[PDB]
Design an enzyme around this catalytic site. Structure first.
Site, PDB file in Angstrom:
ATOM      1  N   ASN A   1      -1.545  -0.087   7.319  1.00 14.14           N
ATOM      2  CA  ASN A   1      -0.960  -1.386   7.771  1.00 14.14           C
ATOM      3  C   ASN A   1      -0.252  -2.118   6.666  1.00 14.14           C
ATOM      4  OD1 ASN A   1      -3.308  -2.113   6.291  1.00 14.14           O
ATOM      5  ND2 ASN A   1      -3.865  -3.792   7.680  1.00 14.14           N
TER       6      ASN A   1
ATOM      7  N   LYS B   1       0.873  -1.155   0.135  1.00 13.43           N
ATOM      8  CA  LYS B   1      -0.046  -0.003  -0.120  1.00 13.43           C
ATOM      9  C   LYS B   1       0.899   1.401  -0.046  1.00 13.43           C
ATOM     10  CE  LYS B   1      -3.722  -2.202   2.685  1.00 13.43           C
ATOM     11  NZ  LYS B   1      -4.492  -2.562   3.621  1.00 13.43           N
TER      12      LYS B   1
ATOM     13  N   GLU C   1     -10.043 -10.044  -6.809  1.00 16.15           N
ATOM     14  CA  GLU C   1      -9.232  -9.033  -6.707  1.00 16.15           C
ATOM     15  C   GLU C   1      -8.123  -8.965  -7.898  1.00 16.15           C
ATOM     16  OE1 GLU C   1      -7.835  -9.509  -2.516  1.00 16.15           O
ATOM     17  OE2 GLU C   1      -9.272  -8.593  -1.735  1.00 16.15           O
TER      18      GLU C   1
ATOM     19  N   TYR D   1     -13.059  -1.582  -1.702  1.00 19.95           N
ATOM     20  CA  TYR D   1     -13.331  -1.789  -0.390  1.00 19.95           C
ATOM     21  C   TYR D   1     -14.946  -1.351  -0.027  1.00 19.95           C
ATOM     22  CZ  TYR D   1      -8.460  -1.380   1.428  1.00 19.95           C
ATOM     23  OH  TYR D   1      -7.337  -1.614   1.480  1.00 19.95           O
TER      24      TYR D   1
ATOM     25  N   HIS E   1      -1.866  -5.568   1.760  1.00 26.67           N
ATOM     26  CA  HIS E   1      -2.980  -6.321   1.759  1.00 26.67           C
ATOM     27  C   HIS E   1      -2.801  -7.675   1.058  1.00 26.67           C
ATOM     28  CE1 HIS E   1      -7.133  -7.313   0.457  1.00 26.67           C
ATOM     29  NE2 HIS E   1      -6.530  -7.825  -0.776  1.00 26.67           N
TER      30      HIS E   1
END
Lengths: 139, 139, 139, 139, 139, 139
Positions: free
Chosen positions: A112, A9, A126, A49, A115
């Site tokens: 974080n 990310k 995805e 999302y 992913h």
């Protein structure tokens, strides 16, 4: 063979962790069969999302995910989906074990680092969202 | 900033060196502004090496680079073309200094792990060959 | 392929450098075809260094190498003798370039961590000294 | 002091992991008091894995274990047997935690990179099987 | 923001682990806002470990803790106290998971490489004991 | 032994390079005999660089070093001043060899990550400037 989707990310990229993360996958014996740096559009972000759209953190989430380049990749191996999610660690880096990617590199729950698909069905969805079919190479 | 072109060759990919190479660039403060894994067509290899067409073992040079997936990338930073060329080192990995990517990793001239543009004019040519402009990312 | 002889010296062993040295060779594509930990007899040290018998502090050279366990090994790969000699670097670790094993790790000429054969004829002599032929492995 | 036996299996060697694994032991503060690269005979393989001889995977197991060189070693420290087995991780790398050797480096259950004695009694048996008594050095 | 206290103990320093430990904190995204090498006086040692003073290992503990230089530091981040104690691992390195600092680097329970505050109140006390107020920098 | 002075500059600190730099010194066998994180006053920067007062962009040199916290340290070992100067490399990181700290890490002459004394007489001056004698530790 089993395939899963990963994205490093914008925090991961901005902090210079692309090589360390990729090396952990390589050393694990996983094959990268697609990869690229991209900028995720707000549309693609919201689509990805969608599940969180009624949550009070949703736009912060989409602003973060679209705030710089990411690395998207596809990884192939025996038990890929499950193995890469253990490698990546608990969503909240404060609860992720040392030795995991989020355990060694993250602090916030939103930012974080990385992913990974949470299920084989999520991997198919995805992969199809982020990659055209021809961006998949075989080796 | 200056931009330069790098390719991690099929041997680099096959030997699991993508992360290690990339961390070297990140640790140097270089910015990846485009990246993908791809499989180079003989046609495209031939164009990349067009200045080598009339030299020995031309078709072997093209074999080395079409024999598996490569990682193609664009790196941006102060002095990038020259800094990157010094970090990769001499064409021949036996002559490449220790501390360079080719010194530390390369087997022989053909199996030398990686390419980097040798001049800013090479970089411009090599970036246009490998990337449409939309695959470049401003960060 | 070419073969060469390497010894991780007692200081290298005692300082916990065996893995780091070995990874450098593996990352270079070198093949370990024989290896063991051993304790070199004064007699055998004296033979290894027989050309140094009439030079200063001969008995100190032999002290350094018999003072603890060493790791003896044989490495095979394209240009091994020369590649290995460049990776280990100058005898004197203060003069050894950064990026070499002696540059990055060595304290002084006596405590210089490692030895590697200086010529193919040295390598043949040094391999016969340290290894019976049965301890060599084809892979 | 407590001692345990380790073997880096042919996949570990072939994939260039000898140095990384040894470094993890060194960094842990364990002493290597014997070590060598060897080729395990089919007889020694069957003797060692005798416990699995009526299992349908037995010959595959012995073909793998004898298919290239291994590194055998003896490691000494406080709680060596137990500590090295936590370090090595669960037999099935898919269940081995990140930070363990099998967790960071393995995928298959058969080709799981490395072996460590499972009990002090197994260490004695395993040491005696693989090492002559004189191959043990003290430091 | 949350702050915790860390000390790399004389074994950590003597064994050359200062950089590896600091790198783990940096990579985790924690900020060092104070740091220094010091020699802890027997008075400061007894004050710090006051809780163990009636234990039969107390003077051994103070002899060890005062037997060479330590590195004291203050670390700032989201959940710093809790996160750094997971990173550091169980007091007894034999029970500390691989991937933790004590799991990767310790063997004895007394000489266990490193210390981290066990609670926010312990951090305040520990910071005040080891640092004058002006040794705290902000960035 | 010889002692020398090193400063990890604000860019080195801000980019999370303190551990990596320090491990390079530890792996070299160098002993840290004093260390702290601090913020250098303009006054003290001006003294450190007093020989540069009448040269171009003097006040920029002082800006670079007062713009955030630095880690100041003293390192002891055989040939320290020269060994450390070679490990840090050329002032200009584009000219610094790969394998040096400035080659591997530095962006440009101003953002060059680190300083080390250039002579034993520089080291004595620079150590007295930065450290009272009590902050030195014998080990």
């Amino acid at each position: 063979m089993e395939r899963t989707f990963v994205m490093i990310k914008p925090d991961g990229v901005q902090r210079g962790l692309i090589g360390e993360i990729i090396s952990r996958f390589e050393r694990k014996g996983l094959k990268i069969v697609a990869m690229k740096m991209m900028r995720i559009s707000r549309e693609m972000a919201e689509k990805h999302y969608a599940e969180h759209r009624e949550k009070p953190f949703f736009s912060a989430l989409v602003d973060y995910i679209t705030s710089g380049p990411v690395v998207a990749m596809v990884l192939e191996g025996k038990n890929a989906v499950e193995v890469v999610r253990k490698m990546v660690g608990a969503t909240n880096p404060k609860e992720a074990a040392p030795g995991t990617i989020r355990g060694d590199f993250g602090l916030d729950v939103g930012k974080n680092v990385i992913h990974a698909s949470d299920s084989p069905e999520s991997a198919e969805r995805e992969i199809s969202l982020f990659f055209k079919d021809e961006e998949l190479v075989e080796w």
